[PDB]
Structures are given as C-alpha cells and as structure tokens.
Design a binder for this molecule. Sequence first.
Ligand code: NAG
Ligand code: NAG
Ligand code: NAG
Lengths: 501, 501, 501, 71, 71, 71
Amino acid sequence: FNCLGMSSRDFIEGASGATWVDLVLEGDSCITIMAADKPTLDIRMMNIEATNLALVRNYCYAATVSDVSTVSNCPTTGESHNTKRADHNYLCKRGVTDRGWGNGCGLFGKGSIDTCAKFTCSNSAAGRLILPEDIKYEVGVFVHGSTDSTSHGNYSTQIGANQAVRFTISPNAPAITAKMGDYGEVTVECEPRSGLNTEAYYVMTIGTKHFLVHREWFNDLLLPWTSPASTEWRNREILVEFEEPHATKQSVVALGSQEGALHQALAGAIPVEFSSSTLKLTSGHLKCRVKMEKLKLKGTTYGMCTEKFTFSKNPADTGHGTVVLELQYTGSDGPCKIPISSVASLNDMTPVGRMVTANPYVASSTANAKVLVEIEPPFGDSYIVVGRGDKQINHHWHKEGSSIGKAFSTTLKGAQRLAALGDTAWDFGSVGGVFNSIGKAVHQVFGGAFRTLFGGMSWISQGLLGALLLWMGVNARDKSIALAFLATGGVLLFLATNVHA
Amino acid sequence: FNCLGMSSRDFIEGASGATWVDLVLEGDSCITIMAADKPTLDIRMMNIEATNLALVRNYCYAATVSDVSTVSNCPTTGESHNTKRADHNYLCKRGVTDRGWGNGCGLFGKGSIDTCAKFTCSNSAAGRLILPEDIKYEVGVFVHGSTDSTSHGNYSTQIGANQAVRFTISPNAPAITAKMGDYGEVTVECEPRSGLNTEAYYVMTIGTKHFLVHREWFNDLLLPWTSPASTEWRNREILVEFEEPHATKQSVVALGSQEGALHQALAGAIPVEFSSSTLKLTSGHLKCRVKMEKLKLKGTTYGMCTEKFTFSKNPADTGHGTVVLELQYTGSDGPCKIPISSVASLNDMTPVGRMVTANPYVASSTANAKVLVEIEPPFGDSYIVVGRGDKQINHHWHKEGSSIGKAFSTTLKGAQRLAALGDTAWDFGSVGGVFNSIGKAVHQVFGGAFRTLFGGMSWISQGLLGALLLWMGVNARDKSIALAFLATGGVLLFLATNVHA
Amino acid sequence: FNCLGMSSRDFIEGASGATWVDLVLEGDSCITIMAADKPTLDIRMMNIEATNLALVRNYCYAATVSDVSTVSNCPTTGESHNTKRADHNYLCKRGVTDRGWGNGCGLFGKGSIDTCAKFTCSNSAAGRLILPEDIKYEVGVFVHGSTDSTSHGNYSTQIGANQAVRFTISPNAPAITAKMGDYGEVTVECEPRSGLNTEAYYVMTIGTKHFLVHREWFNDLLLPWTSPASTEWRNREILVEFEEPHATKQSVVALGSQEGALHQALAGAIPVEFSSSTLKLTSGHLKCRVKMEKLKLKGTTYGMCTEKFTFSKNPADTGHGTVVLELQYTGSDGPCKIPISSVASLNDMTPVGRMVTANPYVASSTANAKVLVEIEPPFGDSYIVVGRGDKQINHHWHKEGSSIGKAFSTTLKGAQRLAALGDTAWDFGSVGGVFNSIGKAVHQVFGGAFRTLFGGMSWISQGLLGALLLWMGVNARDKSIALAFLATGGVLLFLATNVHA
Amino acid sequence: QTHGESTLVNKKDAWLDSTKATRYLTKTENWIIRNPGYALVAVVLGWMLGSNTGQKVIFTVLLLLVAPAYS
Amino acid sequence: QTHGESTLVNKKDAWLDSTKATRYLTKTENWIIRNPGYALVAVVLGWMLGSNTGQKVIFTVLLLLVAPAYS
Amino acid sequence: QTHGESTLVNKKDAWLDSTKATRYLTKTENWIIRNPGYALVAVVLGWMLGSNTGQKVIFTVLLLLVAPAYS
Ligand SMILES: *[C@@H]1O[C@H](CO)[C@@H](O)[C@H](O)[C@H]1NC(C)=O
Ligand SMILES: *[C@@H]1O[C@H](CO)[C@@H](O)[C@H](O)[C@H]1NC(C)=O
Ligand SMILES: *[C@@H]1O[C@H](CO)[C@@H](O)[C@H](O)[C@H]1NC(C)=O
C-alpha cells in the first residue's frame, strides 16, 4: 500500500529492458519501485493471517496441591505403597525416613515412606501449530497518481480511483493480477509457501498473551505437559516439591505460578494477535517476482495548469531523502498537469531530482483541489519550483548528506538485510540473476555451515567467539586459514552488533 | 533428648580428670557423652526460637497495571514529558514512534512518546531480620537411666522421673544449671550469640512459605522493592512491559506473577516455621561447653540381682555400632542393678565392650519390669551375657565392622563435620590443650582467605576448579607450589563432593 | 544324631591337656569327637529352621493381556493418549504408524498410535527375607554306648536310653547344655548369628518350589515386580509384546509363562522346604565350641564279661578308615564290659588301634544281646580280638591304604573345607592357638580382596583366568609378580576344579 | 540468580535438594543437544591455539562450558 | 532456558528488547560483585599458565567468565 | 542371567547339578558347529593381531570364545 509514514523505505530502480523485478517485500517495510517510463509502484505487505490452528502440547504453569496422605513402613519391609497411587491425578513420590522403637518399628535404620498429593492444574499455556496451507499473506499495491493527503491512505477512496488494490496471497492463489483503470495491470507471481517457515514456529498462548516460539524451544520446556484432549499430565514432579521426609506426616507444597518465568523465558518471542481462531502477525517476508510488462503510463497527458498553486502543506522531508509536499490548486481547469520540478538553481530550470510521483496532475475539476507530490531532490542546496512564470512558488530546500554518505548507508542497510534474511536477500531487487544465482548458491552453502556450527547462540557469545577468532587469526601462520578466521570473526562481530545490544 | 532413632549420633569419651568437655551441639545431631564414672549424658539442641522480627524490604512478585495513558509529540519537537511522571505510583517510559501525515502530525520522523502506567503490587515477599538478643535456643539434656522402650521417648514420663529436662539458652542467660532426681546438677555454660550468626541471615516470607536466606543474596534480587511501611516502589520497571510504540497509543502489560521464579531461585534456602512472629527452625549449631563435676551416679548402693532376665524385645542395631536391647526382670527383689556385660566369648567372659548405659538398674519393685539397655559391642562376634550361674541368659551378636573401616568412617565424618561447621569444628569433643587452639587459629586464618576467594561458588564450579588446580599442580615444576596446588584442589574436590550432587 | 553310614564324617581328636574344641558343624556332615578318656560323642546339626518371613518383591512370570484397544492420531496433530490409560492395570505404549488418505487423514506421513491392554498377572513368584533373629539351628548330640544296630538309627530308642538329645540353638540362647542319664552334661557355645549369612539370602517361591537365592541376583531380575501388599505392578512392558502397528488396530499378545526361564536361571539355587511360614534347610554351617568338662564315663563300674561273644553281623568298613561290627553275647552276667581291641599281631595282643566307641559294654541283662562296636584299626593287617583263652573270638581286618595316602587325603579334605568355608575353616579343631588366629586373619584379608575382585564368575571362567595367569607368570620377568600370578592361577583352577565339572 | 548452598549447617535438605545435581547441568546439556554442531568448533579451536595437549583439552572443555551458559 | 533472538525478520521489538543487553550480563556482574576475591584467582591462574601474554589473557577472561555462569 | 554357584556351604547338590558342566558350553559348541566358517577368521585375526607366538594363540582362543557368547 502507501509508503507514507513508514520507518523503513527502499527504492528500486526499474531498468527499461527488464520486465520483471524480484523483491523480498519484508513485513512492516515498504518497497517502492521507480521505473524509467512506467509509473512508480510501491507495495507493502500488511499482515499475515492464519486459521485452523491445532494444539500440540499444553504446558502447565500453575499447579494446585491438596489432600496429602502418607503411608510408611518398617525399615526391613519393602517400600510402602499408598492406596491413592492407583487413582490418577495423584502425584506420588517415595522416600526414606528414620524409624525407631519410639516410632513403633522393631528395627532401626532407613525406613521407607510414600506420600500422595492431589495434583490439579489451574491454567495451562497451550501451544498451537500453524499449517502452511492456511497462511494468507495480505499484500497491497499502489500507483502514485493524483492523491489527496487525507485520502493517501484511505483504501476506500484509493480503490474507488482504481489505484490501490489489496489482494491476499495464499498457496492456493500464489499469483494475482492487479487491475488498474488507466495504468494497466500489474501481475505478481509471489511464492507464499517459502515465505514464512511454518515448520519451525509455534503459537504459544499464555492466558491472553500470544507469542510465536520456535519448534525446539517449545519442546524443551521443563513444565508438566499433556497431549491435546488428554486429562493425564506428564512430568508433574516439577511444580510440586516435598519439603522434608516426616514419618508422621510429610508436608507437600507446590511451587508458585510459573507464569512470570515463562514471560522471562520469552525474551525473543514475537508477540502476535489471536482472536476467533484468526492469527494475525506482521513479521515475515514473501519472495515476490513483480511483473511490470503490462504496467504502462497514461497515454493522454493534460496541459499545464495556469492558475496559482498554493502549498496546503509545506515540503517536509520524510527522512529517506524524499520530500513530500501538498499543492492546492486555486483554479478549476479540470484535469491538468502541475508544473513542479526540482532545480539546482533558478538560473537553470532543467530538473535535477527525479519525481517519485508519476506525472503529478490535478484529477479533480473542482476548485481548491489538493494534490500530494513527492520529489527526490539532489544533495546540497536546491529549489522546489512549483509552477512557472509570474505565479511560480519558489521554495528553497537543503538536503543533508552526500553521495558517499548515501552509498555507505545503503551498503549498511544491504548488509543488515542480508543478515536478517539469509540467502533470500540475494533475491531482493534482482532482475537478471546471472550473478545473483551463483551468489545465492554460495550464500546457501556458507549459511548451512554457519547455522550448523553456531545456530542459536546469543549475541554476547557470538561477539566473544568473533573476538577470539580474530585474536587467534591475527597470530595465525598460514594466510588462507588466517583469512578464513578473520572473515568468520568479522561475520560474528557484525551479527553481534546487528542486534544493537 | 534421647539419641535413639537419630540420623546422626556422636559418641565422645570425656578425658579423665577433666571437669568439662566442649561440643558444637549440631542441630538434629544428638551427641552422647560418656565419662569414666559419670552417668551417660546425651545432649540434643531441639530447635531455635526467635521472636519480634523487623522488616527490611518488600519485594513484589505480582503486579497489577491499569490507568494506562500516553502523550505523543511531533518529530523533532522534544520529548512528550507526560504530566503523570511527577505523580507518584505511576511508571512512565519514553519511547520513539514514527509519525507522518497519516498519523495527524505535520513532519516525518521518530516522534517521542511517553506512556505512564499505574503500578499497583498485589502481593509482596516481605523480608525480615533476626535480632541477636531475641534468638533463644532450646537444649534438651538426658541421663541414660532405666526406662521402658515405650516410655524412653515419651517426655512426660521422663520429666516426671527427672531424667530429662528442657532448658532455653539466651544471650543474657548463657549458663543454665539443671537439677535432676539423684544424678546431680549438669551445668551447661555456652555462648548463644556466638553459635548462630544472625548478621548474615534474613527471613523471607513468600506468601505462606518462609525461608532463611542470606543477606547478600536477598539484597541482589531484581524485583520492585520498597522500604518497610512505604508504597514507593523502586526499580519497578522490571515487572511492567511496554508492548510496542504505536501512534497515540501504547498498550502496556505486566508479568503475571513471579512466585515460581522466586521458589526456583531459593535453591539452597532453609525453610523455617513462622507463626505469630515466633520463628522456629530446627537447624543450626550452638558451640556448647558442659561441666560434669556435679554429675554423679545413682543406685550404686544396690547389689546384683538374683532372678532370671528375659529379653522382652530382641536386640537391635542402631547402625552407629551400638546395640539396643530390652530386659525383663522376672523376679521381685526391689531396686537392683542388672549384671549385664558384653564379652568376646563364653570361656573367658572378660568385659571388652564398653557399655553406653552406665550402671543399669531395675527401678520399680514390681514383679515384671522392663529396662532398656544400650551396649557398644566390640568388632566381630560377641556375646551379651546377663549374670552368671544357671540363671544367666546369653545372647550372641555379630556386628559388621572393622577397626580400619571404623577409622576411615570416623575420619570421613570428622572431615564432613569440619567442612560443615568450619572453625568451630575444632572445639567438638575437645577438653582443651595447645593442639586444639593452634589448629583452630590456623583453620580460621585459612578459612577466611578461602571464603573471600570462594564465597558463592557452586559445587560444580568448585569441582571443575579443583580438577584444573590438580592438573596444574601435577605439571608444576616447583615442589612447594605443586604441593600447595594439590592441597587446594583436594580440598575443593572434597568440598564439592560433600554436597553430594 | 548318629553318624553310621554317612559320608563326609570327619573324626577329630582332642588334645589331652585341653578339654574343649571348636567345630564347624557343616550341613549334613557329621563330626565325631574322640577324647583321650572321655566318651566319644558326635554332633551333627540337622537343619536350619526359620520363621516369620516378610515379603520384599513379588515378581510376575505369567502375564495375561485382554481388552486390547487402540487410538490413532493424524500426523502433525499430537500424541494419541488412549482414554483407558487413566485406569491402572492397563499397559499402554505409544507407537508411530503410516497414515494416508485411505486411512481418513488429511495430510499423510508418520502418524501416532497407542494401545491399551489390560495386564493381569496370574502367577507371581514371591521373594521373602529371613530375619537374623528368627533362625534357630537344630543340633543333635549322640554319645556312643551300648546300642543295638537296629536301635542305633531309631531316635525314640536313644531318647529312651537318654544318650541322644536334640536342642535348638538360636541367637536368643546361643549356649545350651545337654542332659544325659549317666554321661554328665555337655555344654556347647555355638554362634548362630554368624553361622548363616542371612543378610545376603532370600527365599524365592516359584509355584510350589522354594529356593534360597542371593540378594544381588534376586534384585536384578527383569520381570514385572510389585512391592509387598501393592496391587500396582511395575515394569510391565517385559511380558507384553506389541506386534504390528496398524492404524485400524494393533495386536497385543502376552509372552508365555516365565516359570521355565526362572528354573533354568536358578543354576546354583539351594532348594528349601517351606510349610506354615517355617523355612527348613539342612545346609549351612554353625561354628561351635563344645565343652566336655562335665562329660564323664559310664559302665566303668561294671566287671568284664565271662561268656563268649559271637559276631551277629560281619564287620563292615565305613570308607573313612573305621570298622563297624556287632557282637552278640550268649551268657547272662548282668551289665558287663566287652573286652575288645585291635592288635597288630596275635603274638603281641597289645592294642595298637584306638576304638571310636570308647568303653563298650552290654547294658541289658538278657541272655542274648546285640552290641555295636566301632573301631579304628591301623593300616595293614589287623586282628580284632574279643576276650582271651578258649572263649576268645578273633577276626582279621585289612585296612587298605597308607599313612602318606591318608595324609594326602586329609590335606585335600582340608583344602576343600577351606574353599567351602573361607575363614571359618581355621576354627575347625582349633584350641585358640596363635598360629590359627593369625592364619584366619590373613585368610580374611586375602579373601576380602579375592571375593571383591572375582565376585560371581562361573567355574569355566575361573579356570580360563587361572590358565591365563599361569601362562603370564611362567613368562614373567620379576620374581614377585611371577610367584603372585602363579599362586593366584593355582587358586583359581583349584576353585574351578573343586565343583567337579 | 540462584540462592546456592546456604552456609548454615543443615543436616536435612534445603528447599530444592532433588535438583541439586540438575540445576547447573540441564541448561548445558539441553543446549549441547540442541546444536551439537558447536562441539567440533571447540575441539578445533583448542587444537589450533593449544600449545600442549592438556592445554588443548582444557581450552576445549572451557569453550564447551562457556557457550551454553552465556557469559 | 531463554528463547533467544528469533530467526524471523522482525522490524519491531520482541517481547523483551529493553533487557536485550542485560539478560546475559546482569547475573555475571552481580556474581562478580558478590565475591570479588575470585577475580585475582583467575588472573594469577591465567598469568602463571599462559606461555604467551595473549594466551594468558584469554585464559584469565575464560575462567572469569566460567565462574559466574556455572557450566 | 544365571544364578551361579551359591556361597552357602552345601554338601548336597544344587537345583541344577547335572547341567553344571554344560549350561556354559552347550550354546558355544552349538554355535561353533552351526558356523564352522568363523574358525578360519578367528585364527587369522589372532595370528595377525599378535607378534609373539603365544599371544597369537591367546588371541585365537579369546576370539573363538567371544564370538558365540556375544558381548
Ligand atoms: C475514508 O473516507 C470515507 C469517506 O469520506 C470515510 O467514510 C472513511 O471513514 C474513511 N476511512 C477512514 C479509515 O476513516
Ligand atoms: C506419655 O505418657 C503419658 C502418661 O504415661 C500418656 O498419657 C501419654 O499419652 C504418653 N505420650 C506418648 C507420646 O507416649
Ligand atoms: C522305633 O521305636 C518306636 C518305638 O517308640 C517303634 O514304634 C518304631 O517301629 C521303631 N522303628 C522306627 C523305624 O521308628
């Protein structure tokens, strides 16, 4: 959908020869495509929705113990067996006491003892598994045309203008052709099944809060767990402890609710929203290959507007190097093209900054029509000239940063994307694939070993291992092993710092 | 009280010509004192009682959060500075959220947001300290007279017969002398305040359960704590989580509880009984000195009996090397002393085995009377002979043990006692001398350094460090350094294995 | 009782200066005590009788499964947890099967299944523990006198003649004196508690046959075993086999009765007699110390016989070097002493061979009486001369063998006794000498390590180890290790060949 | 933070005595089972910078203990 | 056992992100402050065993990290 | 698991006295008869595995005993 007010924004240039573009389209991020002649596209994945989740295990984090009975025997006879052990829901643990003539036994030594405790679980942290055949990515596609600032985001008005259409990408419908009134039709051939790895994530519910935990972590919890639709609990001796072996009566006390321990254990879990068996989370990615073959700019171009232009909202930087401004057209000339450009100086009127909005025009024929325009001025001092002649609204603008700084920032963002996506990052912004295919293959080969050797290790441990590798490689003898150790240590340090810890 | 049926029992023999003997008097470890001619004395510290405790902190394991309100500011327009920050009992945290024209702001960027939440704590885990003056011990002393096995452990019949009394030791009453029927007056002059150090222990009340935790551990807890009788919670952001910075809204959630985390954190805490502000713990130790100058025998005037002794209860082994048997006197000759002794064989009948119950005597003049007798047979086969002539009754006993095995077991028990008690262990069963004082001084000067170096180290860490020290010492070139490292590693390994984990 | 026609009968000659000797009283191995002047008596313990046994573990060997039901779960759905698992006596085991579209599941793969079968035990082998106090050895003492051959074996006649008497030796009365009509009193000082190591033996009952098995073996069996007075079985999966995992149903069949397997497993188990909870085994040894201080002669007042003696039955050898003959008296001169001796030659008439039945006589005054006389002639030709003059009746005996052969035979017998007893064999015939004491001490020291190092090896494994030790010793370099290995290997095969297998 | 073994003499058991041999090892063993591929990394790191064989073993075991219990 | 950083690509924060830099270090620092006497022990053990200065520093820091986080 | 010879002094015969010389040999002899081809393997391995002549014989007999009685 619209990229306005999005923290993460990336721009992909569209080659004239290339007809299709491959992009990750990661969640909570907006990808804007700036083609040469075709109108600019910006696609944002809203959320991932799943349905019909099935239980796997029901961990208990709060136990109740009552009705304690104790049976003891003389030291010589075997271990005592309490009559309540036959009944289930009774946690029974044997033990040993000391018996004497005062206690009633005929011999001294380590007498046996057995106790029972009615075990009842109040609430359980049920876990659920997401089937890959149920996830439904929701993807929005937008074309920058004539949009009001208040309407730039209202889906009803945009779909009324046939500019923005939301479609749900599912394994049963991996390809959707988005139809637009005049810009043509844009087709996406996204692959939903490979996007979210539903085979390595559960949905753990702790009361009202829901999470998204890993396969291995949820199966290694040290809590009394039961199979779905099963009354009998397993491993009940964790929440229940026996204080001291007492021959007359042993006291059984249950530990407090482990709800806080679970929340502290969910350090890296991704909270989700669960309601009416409808999962709705936003994190994740879907590798889409957007085909811009049928996407065309409008053939008809209107004449330049002649009436005075007023800034409804002054030009404000979005932080991505693009300037968003809103123009209110005082006159009523019907559809006309706004004469807006970004120039280095008033001497030379040749535009220097590419326009994100494709041919901004005043679609409405009514007076005081508002049109939102986005520009990408060049670095340094610049002028945003709106209109021409005696009515031009000259507005100075200074854009911080330089080309080298932008290059370094883009390299850092690409490195972060590669670290946060693995091999799929080589498929971002790829049109040819002549060199990205071998790059993707070698990245898969390296990543398999990297996840095998290191896997789920904390950032501090990764940083320490990287520092150790650097220290032992700077003193290494052979150049090849030294270079390999230096590269591995650099990767570990980058991953440790990428967490921003 | 009676050492019968006790997990740990200690036998010490008083030195001839020594009026007093010093003993550490471990909790739940009944100690038996045998002298050359004084009646057998067994002393057991039943429990420790403390009253009028004072609070130190109030940690919170359960918190309730409501009245969540937030204020947001435009990007680059300063922080929100919510008005509730000065309002107490309101937890506020400042975050950054992206703001755009869609959210109603004028500019674009990370606009600061401050969310304040009403922090109300439902349940507090109050901690208390023990006043050194209010802690009073409870020591029970017993003299091994003649009592029935059924009445041997019953206190009412013993206090009626003046064979056992309960007296309390307090800082202002260190020396208490207890009078008995005819055995004399046993003087117990001990230092109560120097026995258990209350300057390093706290009483923590988590709901209903109570514990005795360290002062250093209790002050390092990461929980919202307040001073007693105050509602100002400090460091209270641990139990409250701010979900996600959203425009003009930020829902906050608190962790459900922390009882489970606390109970799991109290690994080695010592549970105690707390009721009506009257602490009652059965553990601890109390360095004690008992003066037996006024202790004297009873019934030495009576001669030997002239009737048949029948074993009403078959002899049983206590497991500490002493046999316990019950004798029934068939005749009616009034008070008389039983001529029972342990001999190596029937042909020699030379008394070789010491007798714990010194000078047994039939108390009542009834025709049928039952007397409990405890003996310490020598290693190997032995006979328990009662009298001479055709009226004697013999019993065979074959205790399983050896002199070398006894020495090894005694050395192991002494090492465990030294590890558990520390410096005060050198005063156990010591009547004085230069050896004990020098040993105690050396043990103190080494244990201070040992505790400073290894204060909170776990058994596993201690074992690993001991193994590393041994492996370093075996490779050490210097003899003295190698010997020191070997000794330190051996001590660490023994201490780790003493935990038996 | 009497020892006529009994194998493993070891004669013992007491020292003339001493009056008491120590015996071992093997199981069904009588020992005859030959004193210098006192009448010769033989004591043989008949059986070890115990009572009041207590259950320890009730093993099962006859399973019976029924009511088999199964529950199948689809893949990626969870475990099955058959509802009958809540009830006890229902063995359940979870398995994995193959699921498909035809099986009714949605997504096919590796499903889950569990099966519940009602496990009931029909026949249970119950083990019992023998209390050390309850065992009461039965010892019979017989004094050789005028006994007819027919009446020699009859116990009622000996009671009437007041020669033999049965007394029970128990730990409650280890020393018991025997009553004789005219031979005085015999006092024995046996040690029953140390005789049979009842701590390491059980009484296993399999059907109607009872066996005395080791402690370690009985606790290491692999069968469904339950604690005494406990309905809940434990480790039930041994006797139940789940054959075919099928989604529709799973076949559960119980294995056959393990009664034969136990009998095949009881290789060296000692069968015993059980009736009314009274164990009765004839094996075992009871160390004793028999005192003949009050043992005196009978018949010395009688004069010599006048009539002629006719051999009622021909003399017969015993196999231990002694001769048993029966003499018939023709006249009637009242109680008279039989003149009978063994002479090397008839020209000397000097008794050379001692007589086992000391002081033979004819108690009855009937005209014809039968008297059994047992002699111990020397090696070679010997003449049994009765009377003198014309009434002398002669008989020739040839004791085949030699002194050296008898020396080797008794050395081998002593070696077998040492192997079958251990240290108690050094108490056989000892009078408390220093040599025997140090021998027993060193034997205990060596045997502790010998049993610890070689605990439960079979006879063939012992032989193989001994052969390997011999081969290594004969090729060893150092003399000490060579001789040690030679001695150990010799002991090993002596033990291996002792069982005669 | 765990309380640890109390310095007071207590012949009986503490609040948690059954888990005395598991509290310090369950996390390490579960982490080692979780990602067993790290085991060879410690071995090769010890063999690389280890001057002595005993030193190599010490470094390997120290790394295998540091990695599960982070810091 | 903590969940750790998720393998999913999350632009937002996880359940606990403020304590991301403290959950792995507060326990170690609190243990070190509790008994600072151990600090010299690890230092001397590393210094007297390492054949090189870098090796000695590595061993010192490795032991000082092993001690707080048991196993 | 067989019970083995009892430590109690017994001049009588045990439960299975006849089979005392066969329980430990019948299985081995049946196996070696049923599988005569292993004998050459055992002797070859014994000859190769040792240098001394006696060591070779010991190896051969030990392997020939091991094979029928697994583990
Ligand atoms: C979009 O515009 C329509 C018509 O003005 C209005 O009803 C609707 O509420 C707007 N959308 C939102 C989210 O307010
Ligand atoms: C102790 O003795 C008194 C009187 O003999 C009796 O009432 C009481 O029940 C006894 N208590 C115990 C515990 O035996
Ligand atoms: C033994 O003597 C009794 C007389 O008490 C007699 O009845 C019996 O037949 C005799 N023989 C045997 C073998 O018991």
